[PDB]
From a paper:
M1.[name] is a DNA adenine MTase that belongs to the type II R-M system. M1.[name] encoded by ORF hp0050 is an N6-adenine methyltransferase belonging to the β-class MTase. It has been reported recently that this enzyme recognizes the sequence of 5′-GAGG-3′, 5′-GGAG-3′ or 5′-GAAG-3′ and methylates adenines in these sequences. The structural basis and the catalytic mechanism underlying such a distinct activity are not well understood due to the lack of an available 3D structure of this enzyme.Here, we report the crystal structure of M1.[name] from [name] 26695, which is the first determined N6-adenine MTase structure in [name].
Residue numbers in the entry:
A (entry chain A): 1 to 33, 58 to 159, 171 to 232
B (entry chain C): 1 to 31, 62 to 113, 115 to 156, 172 to 231
C (entry chain B): 1 to 31, 59 to 115, 117 to 153, 155, 173 to 231
D (entry chain D): 1 to 31, 61 to 110, 118 to 146, 148, 150 to 155, 172 to 231
């Protein structure tokens, strides 16, 4: 099942309250990254998650401490952080500074939740991909995140879905996606990648 | 030159003000925001800091630094090949962090090898080799490196092998004399 | 009609969505963070012509008012009342005698108001008497008032004396049974 | 001593840094409006305070901002003075002191609401309270004056700034010059 909306996440959320919607996991990459604003989508969307559900939020090292504390204020337990590295950076300036090859994501679960994890064998580390693509997002990255923290019929929610790619990953993994995007061009891009019409 | 102290970093620091001390780089792994503000005045105009931290803090420490006249340039990380608690419900934590910040108008060091870039100096078999690479990068041979919490040393030992002139402080008696043995009398 | 619950306002709210509850006025004094978040969740329950009256602090009220205006409410005004027996300086400081409340209405609403025989406004009082006048003003006789934090009651009691059909929630069991007895069981 | 300037508070402030100026209390009613605080805070002496007239749609922000700049927010003071809404009787002011300050306060014979009916009496009573006889009072936006005039009558050594010339010459006349 794939269902996407063209809307403002801070408005359709009220409609989700009326429908008493339940989703298994929110896997998203929020905008930006008073800090409330916007940690606030978290406080607003946190009630949708099932007792055993989790969250995965992509972010910047200048924020993650704030996001994590906020999550644990809203009824989640932060288990760990995951990362993925790009092999071809911008660079940009290599004689005065490090290249930023690395992006981060936060992983938190509901408080008394029995969470998924789900671990192919092997036994496994903190960084899903060495990836390729230079300069988002790679389908392969999202597929491995979604392969890990969700199971086949669990409901995945991406309040900012952008191009899709969270939804596309869920589809290939047969995971029942719901997603939201504000701007029409990205919405139409996600909608075409996901067929429908 | 190597000089170590057995003391509380939050008290002997005042003695440093009286001595009008200046240091080139502070490289440490503290055992939390406020020591930065008190040890920041010791830093030279072109100096930097490298502070080991946790992902639950690193965002705070970065912001606190930028309030005190430093610019957070980047973060570095290094991985252990040997951690394991329950691997079936969770990731193993292989990854450790440090924050890299420089003085505001500083002309900082960097100093890359023939090698190139990235964000991650080492994997493993804390480690002297790691500290050796941090100090090799962010300091020059005669600069003064300060470690307000030096623990075992190894910031000091790395500095000694690289001929970089260490100063350090340790509160707990066991670790200090361990550090005192590792360098020399 | 009076209905009270022993529960957490941040959970039972979903039950209010299932029941499609609609309320005319929310008049409450919450016990920072979550002080803004209940607004966004409880706001949809208010009828097109309804209002809110929120007790708050001068250290907050600018936030709450502005938050109200992003959520489909219009901040109309603030009201205040004075306490005759405050306590902490007094030799170094003002006595804190004054408490505030926020008054907001739904955006396109034709709101209640409803002033008595004489003239003018803004400082109701010198408690039941306070709430009776607030409720006498901003609601009409058969309208529905909701107090997600009712504490001792007294928001409900004012509604009962004024025949205004109260709903209220209280988390702490001691205060709830206080309100439950104060009304009846 | 009374000293007034006709200028913009957001640049002449730099001249005040050059003169190494220090003022004991800033008492003002500004016409964004948070940052003048950040620039004018260093001028305040260790035991000094600030009194800022503001709106309840702001008062919480200004307070938080004051406490970001090295002041501690003590309290607010207020004074008086459509059929469908309340009449607006109330104006606010924020009162803050420097952090480790031993501040003024200075209450009468004795005990938040100074007046029942800017009035010179209001400002005179504020200044009678939060300053002492020779302390230096600064009003970066002084408008019509009346902060300077209270300070003159109470012998408090005023400094003030106004951008618009109409109010300035009115303030200049009231202070003689």
């Amino acid at each position: 099942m794939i269902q996407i909306y063209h809307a403002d996440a801070f408005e359709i959320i009220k409609d989700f309250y009326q429908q008493n919607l339940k989703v298994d996991a929110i896997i998203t990459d929020p905008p930006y990254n008073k800090n409330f604003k916007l940690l606030e989508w978290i406080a607003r969307y946190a009630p949708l998650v099932n007792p055993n559900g989790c969250m995965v939020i992509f972010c910047s090292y200048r924020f993650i401490s704030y996001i994590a504390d906020f999550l644990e204020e809203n009824g989640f337990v932060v288990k760990d952080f995951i990362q993925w590295v790009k092999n071809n950076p911008m660079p940009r300036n290599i004689h005065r500074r490090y290249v930023q090859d690395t992006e981060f994501a936060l992983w938190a679960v509901k408080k008394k939740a029995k969470w998924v994890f789900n671990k192919p064998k092997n036994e496994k580390y903190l960084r899903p991909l060495i990836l390729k693509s230079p300069v988002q997002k790679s389908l392969a990255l999202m597929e491995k995140i979604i392969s890990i923290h969700t199971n086949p019929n669990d409901i995945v929610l991406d309040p900012f879905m952008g191009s899709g790619t969270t939804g596309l990953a869920c589809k290939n993994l047969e995971r029942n996606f719901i997603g939201i995007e504000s701007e029409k061009e990205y919405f139409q891009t996600a909608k075409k990648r996901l067929n429908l019409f």
